[PDB]
Amino acid sequence: SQIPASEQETLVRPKPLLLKLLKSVGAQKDTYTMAEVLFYLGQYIMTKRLYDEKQQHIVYCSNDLLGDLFGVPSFSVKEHRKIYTMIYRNLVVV
């Protein structure tokens, strides 16, 4: 956060639409700190799949020589076994 601590702990009362949204994912109250609002928005965001975590770590290799060699348009940098399998089809163990 580039937001000062004092600001994060500011006590606030969500308007009716923001309140309904927060309670829709389990918020219990009518007043919150700003830190609490952000926690519940985070839950809302993840629940409505407005952010995708897997898609944060993707190589897009279609129409590139790498896509030709691996035989795929995309892959996760976090899935090492899957990369190794694709690499092995392009070499010989000595």
CB of 43 to its own copies, least distance (A): 12
Supply 52's token pair: 């995708």
Partner interacting with residue 93 (select from ligand TVH, its own copies, none; CB below 5-8 Å by kind): its own copies
Binders of its own copies in range 23-42 (CB under 8 A): 31, 34, 37-38, 41
**Residue linked to tokens 């700190």:** 33
**Residue linked to tokens 């994912």:** 25
Distances (CA, A) of 40 to 6, 57, 79, 83: 19, 25, 30, 36
Supply 8's token pair: 């994060």
DSSP bridge partners of 60: 74
Partner interacting with residue 48 (select from ligand TVH, its own copies, none; CB below 5-8 Å by kind): its own copies
Summarize as ranges the residues that interact with its own copies (CB under 8 A): 1-3, 7, 10-15, 17-18, 21, 31, 34, 37-38, 41, 44-45, 48, 50-51, 55-61, 64-66, 68-69, 77, 80-81, 83-84, 87-88, 90-94
